[PDB]
Structure 1
Amino acid sequence: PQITLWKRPLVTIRIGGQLKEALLDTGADDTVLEEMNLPGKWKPKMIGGIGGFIKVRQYDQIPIEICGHKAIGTVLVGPTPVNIIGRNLLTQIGCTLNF
């Protein structure tokens, strides 16, 4: 699809049989979801943004379907203000910016 930006580009993602709303975030290097359970091993990681750094759990090679498009990649889980789809998965679904 083509998504304009007068509203937040929120979309429905599917991850582990669960539907969630997430923000398509071109200013985010990585994908970070609010606290949830995911299966498998994780690694502690720290990521930073405008307000400083947080601790997250890094899960690798996780399937997520984003607005019907398949990605499999790294998903961080932690105290993000909102669920964020970052460039690591936006590239997988063929997302570009256009003007």
Structure 2
Amino acid sequence: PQITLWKRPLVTIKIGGQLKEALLDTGADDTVIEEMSLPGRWKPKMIGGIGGFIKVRQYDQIIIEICGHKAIGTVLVGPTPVNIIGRNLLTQIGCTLNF
């Protein structure tokens, strides 16, 4: 698909058996999701951007489905204002910028 940028590029994702809305974000190194349960071990991480840093839990080898494309990667969970799909998963679904 081709997604224009007149509005926020929001998509439905499936993660941890839950459906969520998330933003396809080429400015994010990592993927961060609002508070939810995920399986496995985690470790704490700080992530920073406009407004400063927040603390999140880092879960590895999590499967997500993003617009019908399956991928696996690290997912961070914490008090993000918006669910964000970052480059670590955008690459896996073959997402590129084109102009």
> Deviations for 1:78-98, whole angstroms, at most 9, x for unmatched residues?
011100000000001000000
> Deviations for 1:14-40, whole angstroms, at most 9, x for unmatched residues?
012111000000000000001111111
**Contact 2:57/2:76 (<8 A) preserved:** yes
Residue number in structure 2 paired with 1:39: 39
- 1:66 is displaced (CA, Å) by 0.2
Displaced runs of 4 or more, over 4 A: none
Unaligned stretches of 5+ residues in structure 1: none
- SS of aligned partner of 1:89: helix
Q: How far apart are the structure 1 equivalents of 2:28 and 2:20?
A: 18
**Contact 2:16/2:37 (<8 A) preserved:** no
Count of aligned pairs: 99
Unaligned stretches of 5+ residues in structure 2: none
Q: How far apart are the structure 1 equivalents of 2:16 and 2:31?
A: 16
TM score, norm. by length of structure 2: 0.98
CA RMSD in angstroms comes to: 0.5
TM score, norm. by length of structure 1: 0.98
Residue number in structure 2 paired with 1:22: 22
Q: How far apart are the structure 1 equivalents of 2:17 and 2:38?
A: 11
